[PDB]
Write an enzyme that holds these catalytic residues in place. Structure first.
Site, mmCIF file in Angstrom:
data_model
loop_
_atom_site.group_PDB
_atom_site.id
_atom_site.type_symbol
_atom_site.label_atom_id
_atom_site.label_comp_id
_atom_site.label_asym_id
_atom_site.label_seq_id
_atom_site.Cartn_x
_atom_site.Cartn_y
_atom_site.Cartn_z
ATOM 1 N N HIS A 190 0.823 -1.212 0.000
ATOM 2 C CA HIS A 190 0.000 0.000 0.000
ATOM 3 C C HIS A 190 0.858 1.264 0.000
ATOM 4 O O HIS A 190 1.870 1.330 0.691
ATOM 5 C CB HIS A 190 -0.907 0.007 1.228
ATOM 6 C CG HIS A 190 -1.912 1.111 1.228
ATOM 7 N ND1 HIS A 190 -2.975 1.146 0.355
ATOM 8 C CD2 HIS A 190 -2.005 2.230 1.981
ATOM 9 C CE1 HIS A 190 -3.681 2.242 0.571
ATOM 10 N NE2 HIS A 190 -3.113 2.918 1.552
ATOM 11 N N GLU A 248 -42.130 -10.489 -2.707
ATOM 12 C CA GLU A 248 -42.708 -11.693 -3.247
ATOM 13 C C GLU A 248 -41.935 -12.193 -4.465
ATOM 14 O O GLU A 248 -42.138 -13.314 -4.932
ATOM 15 C CB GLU A 248 -44.175 -11.451 -3.587
ATOM 16 C CG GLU A 248 -44.828 -12.693 -4.086
ATOM 17 C CD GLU A 248 -46.254 -12.846 -3.639
ATOM 18 O OE1 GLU A 248 -46.964 -13.659 -4.291
ATOM 19 O OE2 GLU A 248 -46.655 -12.178 -2.654
ATOM 20 N N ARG A 299 -40.004 -15.351 5.417
ATOM 21 C CA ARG A 299 -39.540 -14.212 4.649
ATOM 22 C C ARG A 299 -38.827 -13.216 5.564
ATOM 23 O O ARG A 299 -39.458 -12.567 6.409
ATOM 24 C CB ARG A 299 -40.739 -13.547 3.979
ATOM 25 C CG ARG A 299 -40.443 -12.242 3.276
ATOM 26 C CD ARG A 299 -41.730 -11.634 2.761
ATOM 27 N NE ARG A 299 -42.295 -12.406 1.666
ATOM 28 C CZ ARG A 299 -43.535 -12.262 1.222
ATOM 29 N NH1 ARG A 299 -44.336 -11.372 1.791
ATOM 30 N NH2 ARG A 299 -43.972 -13.012 0.214
HETATM 31 O O1 LIG Z 1 -45.927 -6.608 1.860
HETATM 32 C C1 LIG Z 1 -45.420 -7.740 1.541
HETATM 33 O O2 LIG Z 1 -44.187 -7.975 1.675
HETATM 34 C C2 LIG Z 1 -46.210 -8.667 0.616
HETATM 35 O O3 LIG Z 1 -47.544 -8.741 1.145
HETATM 36 C C3 LIG Z 1 -48.463 -9.569 0.406
HETATM 37 O O4 LIG Z 1 -48.240 -10.990 0.416
HETATM 38 P P1 LIG Z 1 -48.220 -11.896 1.767
HETATM 39 O O5 LIG Z 1 -47.385 -11.258 2.840
HETATM 40 O O6 LIG Z 1 -47.911 -13.291 1.342
HETATM 41 O O7 LIG Z 1 -49.748 -12.107 2.250
HETATM 42 P P2 LIG Z 1 -50.715 -11.377 3.329
HETATM 43 O O8 LIG Z 1 -52.081 -11.275 2.704
HETATM 44 O O9 LIG Z 1 -50.024 -10.108 3.765
HETATM 45 O O10 LIG Z 1 -50.789 -12.388 4.554
HETATM 46 C C4 LIG Z 1 -49.676 -13.200 4.911
HETATM 47 C C5 LIG Z 1 -50.130 -14.625 5.119
HETATM 48 O O11 LIG Z 1 -51.022 -14.665 6.247
HETATM 49 C C6 LIG Z 1 -51.920 -15.742 6.087
HETATM 50 N N1 LIG Z 1 -53.278 -15.283 6.370
HETATM 51 C C7 LIG Z 1 -53.785 -14.152 5.801
HETATM 52 C C8 LIG Z 1 -55.041 -13.740 6.018
HETATM 53 C C9 LIG Z 1 -55.898 -14.496 6.886
HETATM 54 O O12 LIG Z 1 -57.088 -14.255 7.123
HETATM 55 N N2 LIG Z 1 -55.304 -15.612 7.439
HETATM 56 C C10 LIG Z 1 -54.025 -16.055 7.220
HETATM 57 O O13 LIG Z 1 -53.588 -17.065 7.732
HETATM 58 C C11 LIG Z 1 -51.786 -16.271 4.664
HETATM 59 O O14 LIG Z 1 -51.099 -17.490 4.668
HETATM 60 C C12 LIG Z 1 -50.995 -15.161 3.992
HETATM 61 O O15 LIG Z 1 -50.210 -15.663 2.909
HETATM 62 C C13 LIG Z 1 -48.491 -9.128 -1.064
HETATM 63 O O16 LIG Z 1 -49.143 -10.122 -1.835
HETATM 64 C C14 LIG Z 1 -47.103 -8.912 -1.646
HETATM 65 O O17 LIG Z 1 -47.229 -8.275 -2.904
HETATM 66 C C15 LIG Z 1 -46.283 -8.030 -0.751
HETATM 67 O O18 LIG Z 1 -44.981 -7.853 -1.291
#
Ligand SMILES: O=C(O)[C@H]1O[C@H](OP(=O)(O)OP(=O)(O)OC[C@H]2O[C@@H](n3ccc(=O)[nH]c3=O)[C@H](O)[C@@H]2O)[C@H](O)[C@@H](O)[C@@H]1O
Ligand SMILES: Nc1ncnc2c1ncn2[C@@H]1O[C@H](COP(=O)(O)OP(=O)(O)OP(=O)(O)O)[C@@H](O)[C@H]1O
Lengths: 639, 106
Positions: free
Chosen positions: A96, A417, A602
């Site tokens: 260096h 996602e 995630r």
């Molecule tokens: O903000 C985020 O990072 C992501 O949020 C959502 O996707 P996701 O988190 O998979 O789904 P949500 O609807 O937020 O709920 C999460 C998980 O909770 C569960 N859930 C949801 C609703 C419910 O009544 N009960 C239940 O068990 C489902 O398995 C669902 O996949 C969006 O689809 C994505 O585009 C986004 O990037």
């Protein structure tokens, strides 16, 4: 010994020679394309290579083949990393150009002149994970003459290095070397200097300015300034303690060409106007039109879908700063109506698929475009795949193209996602692979669509100079994340859907056990990071992909449901809603329909965020839960 | 195309011979072997040999690849009653011959 060398330019040659004279056997030399290191290697019959990245598996394996005892780095430009470094039992040493741990950065030859040091030197230290931090094996001081310039100090250093290696090299060949560690609390680091860093600011002392012209004198780019619109370069300077009540930057005389500085004056001995030839200052003065006289709106942000969850919060944020002008279009306006009276907010109720005149004209008129129009509620991916595709993908691809057409910066909202069911503990923007399911699992239509858009934006960036920044939110939440009404159709994210449950007295269903987890981020944290990206300080966000989430708030949906319930039971308005109907596990199919598949975990890597924005999530999940719950409960009409 | 009994409607069907798995290195050898035995061989220059290269130096930055690829041909069997037959070496010969006779020699 037997070694593999990484050298380039002058130091590279003197290093390869010292190495040879010291009796070492050079198995191979790695250099760069453009004293030529390659020429030397070829002349000495030493296999030489110049790949772009020697850290590639093939090379690592081939270097390992040569089986070197020690590795040397004499001004190699690309960065050699651990993987290969440890292939040498005797270690890896780097030469260096400074008196480490001082000026351990890069371009020490210039920096030492900029800061007007009285001395510098060469250091042969061991290579470690940290840049220029390894234990020092040998060092050697050099005096910087008051009349030394980059090039002359370069030879001083080259000569010093030739001597340091000459004697400390035989020492390593055997092993008589003391790893005098580096006094970490004394180390100074500097970064790459761009030619814009050689700008002369006459308000500074003549001394400072004088060292600048020396620091980058020919053959370097040189120190420059401006005569109105014209740019000229100062090659030879000369400080004059000879005061002058003249304000800094004004020309004291044109023969010699003497400029008044914050302290004393600076004499421009030789320089050139623009790309013209070099000439004495007196002549440069004429060719620039000098005589005795002085030398040397807010940002428009376009938000489509401004009334949305991200949209309204970002607007609030931007409207706080004064250097912003916000233009926004959206179908709805209840979330942004509170800003309609703001002088710097320009809203218009429109549809991205209809109002072209407005949209195109504004991409053309603004400075940054944030296309936030989309459908991001999972149920819709399976329920209306084509509506999602057309809005999320096609409509936006159109905006992306307006941007390249009018050369505008685009801060496009990607998505966590896009990683799909990635298996890494940390979804990494630059290294993680993306995993989705079969075509018969339509939930991924969204994920895949967003990924193709990211790739198209990337190509436009690479092949057409589009200035962009992709940001990926990780389950952001807080007030206005959807609404209880949309939730009645499942068209809303988890948190806001479970709130509807508690509100209407229906059970909170945990799709497939609800054991899957996510990292919930408070909308306040998310908007701060996004704000930083708009700010794009130092352009550190260009071509970057940045995740934004709080890895600390990881929780299963079941835990989310419990935390929510806990807050709900303690809420003042609780007695207004029915008794809890309880948690109930449900098959995803019964909520999302056929074709649903999910993400078990995630968590984001927030390195890039830290690197480009100096950002770090702060708000803890529980607080977000309370905020969100409160907002929505007070949305319910009670009568 | 025949879609007998409409057994292909809404179907996704892989079409490949899982029996012909081979590394690119092996593909190169098999090809070379045929080439050396070919009638037209003498018309072309001596073999310059096999050489390992970084993908970047051929595809440019941003290349990445697939380490292995073998298809399930269940759907094919089920919807078409199909099964690959021709062995790889034969395909090599066919292809090599065709292209070698594409070269104008004069
Ligand atoms: O903000 C985020 O990072 C992501 O949020 C959502 O996707 P996701 O988190 O998979 O789904 P949500 O609807 O937020 O709920 C999460 C998980 O909770 C569960 N859930 C949801 C609703 C419910 O009544 N009960 C239940 O068990 C489902 O398995 C669902 O996949 C969006 O689809 C994505 O585009 C986004 O990037
Ligand atoms: N055709 C359209 N024209 C204009 N605006 C639209 C159109 N379709 C949807 N929008 C708008 O897009 C806005 C942003 O979507 P929304 O707030 O639902 O999610 P988001 O804030 O992007 O969520 P996340 O950050 O979780 O992805 C909505 O407020 C809505 O007004």
């Amino acid at each position: 010994m037997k070694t593999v060398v990484f050298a380039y330019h002058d130091m590279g040659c003197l290093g390869i020679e010292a190495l040879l004279a010291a009796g070492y056997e050079i198995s191979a030399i790695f250099t760069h394309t453009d004293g030529s290191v390659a020429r030397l290697a070829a002349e000495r019959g030493i296999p030489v290579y110049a790949p772009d990245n020697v850290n590639h598996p093939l090379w690592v394996e081939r270097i390992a083949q040569l089986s070197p005892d020690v590795i040397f780095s004499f001004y190699y430009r690309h960065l050699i990393y651990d993987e290969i470094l440890q292939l040498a039992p005797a270690g890896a040493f780097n030469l260096h150009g400074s008196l480490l741990p001082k000026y351990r950065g890069r371009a020490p030859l210039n920096w030492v002149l900029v800061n007007g040091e009285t001395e510098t030197g060469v250091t042969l230290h061991r290579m470690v994970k940290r840049a220029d931090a390894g234990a020092i094996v040998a060092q050697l001081r050099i005096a910087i003459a008051p009349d030394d310039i980059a090039i002359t100090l370069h030879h001083k250093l080259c000569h010093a290095a030739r001597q340091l290696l000459e004697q400390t090299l035989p020492a390593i060949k055997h092993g008589n070397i003391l790893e005098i560690a580096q006094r970490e609390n004394e180390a100074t680091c500097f970064g790459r200097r761009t030619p814009d860093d050689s700008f002369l600011e006459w308000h500074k002392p003549a001394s400072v300015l004088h060292n600048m012209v020396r620091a980058v004198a020919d053959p370097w780019p040189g120190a420059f300034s401006y005569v109105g619109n014209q740019k000229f370069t100062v090659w030879s300077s000369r400080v004059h303690p000879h005061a002058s009540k003249a304000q800094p930057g004004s020309v004291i005389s044109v023969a010699p060409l003497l400029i008044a500085c914050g302290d004393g004056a600076l004499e421009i001995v030789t320089g050139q106007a623009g790309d013209g030839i070099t000439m004495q200052g007196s002549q440069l003065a004429q060719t620039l039109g000098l005589v005795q006289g002085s030398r040397l709106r807010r940002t428009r942000v376009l938000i489509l879908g401004v009334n949305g969850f991200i949209g309204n919060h970002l607007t609030e944020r931007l409207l706080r700063e004064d250097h912003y002008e916000v233009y926004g279009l959206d179908i709805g306006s209840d979330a942004i109506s509170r800003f309609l009276n703001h002088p710097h907010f320009h809203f218009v109720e429109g549809d991205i698929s209809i109002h072209s005149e407005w949209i195109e004209y504004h991409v053309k008129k603004c400075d940054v475009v944030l296309p936030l129009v989309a459908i991001a509620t999972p149920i819709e991916y399976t329920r209306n795949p084509l509506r999602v595709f057309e809005l999320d993908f096609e409509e936006n691809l159109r905006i992306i193209r307006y941007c390249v057409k009018y050369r505008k910066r685009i801060i496009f909202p990607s998505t966590s996602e896009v990683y799909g069911m990635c298996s890494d503990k940390y979804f990494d923007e630059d290294h993680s692979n993306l995993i989705v399911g079969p075509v018969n699992k339509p939930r991924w239509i969204y994920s895949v669509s967003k990924q193709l858009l990211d790739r198209v934006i990337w190509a436009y960036g690479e092949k057409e100079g589009l200035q962009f920044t992709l940001f990926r939110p990780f389950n952001w939440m807080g007030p206005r994340l959807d609404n209880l009404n949309a939730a009645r159709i499942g068209s809303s994210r988890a948190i806001t859907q479970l709130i509807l449950n508690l509100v209407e007295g229906s059970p909170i269903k945990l799709i497939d056990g609800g054991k899957q987890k996510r990292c919930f981020t408070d909308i306040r944290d998310g908007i701060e990071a996004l704000y930083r990206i708009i700010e794009n300080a130092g352009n550190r966000c260009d071509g970057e992909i940045i995740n934004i989430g709080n890895p600390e708030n990881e929780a299963s949906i079941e835990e989310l449901g419990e935390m929510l319930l806990a807050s709900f039971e303690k809420h003042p308005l609780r007695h207004h809603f029915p008794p809890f109907a309880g948690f109930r596990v449900v098959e995803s199919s019964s909520y999302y329909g056929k074709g649903y598949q999910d993400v078990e975990h995630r968590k984001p890597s927030i390195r890039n965020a830290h690197r480009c924005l100096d950002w770090e999530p702060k708000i803890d999940m529980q607080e977000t839960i309370d905020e969100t719950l409160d907002f929505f409960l007070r949305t319910v009409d009670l009568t």
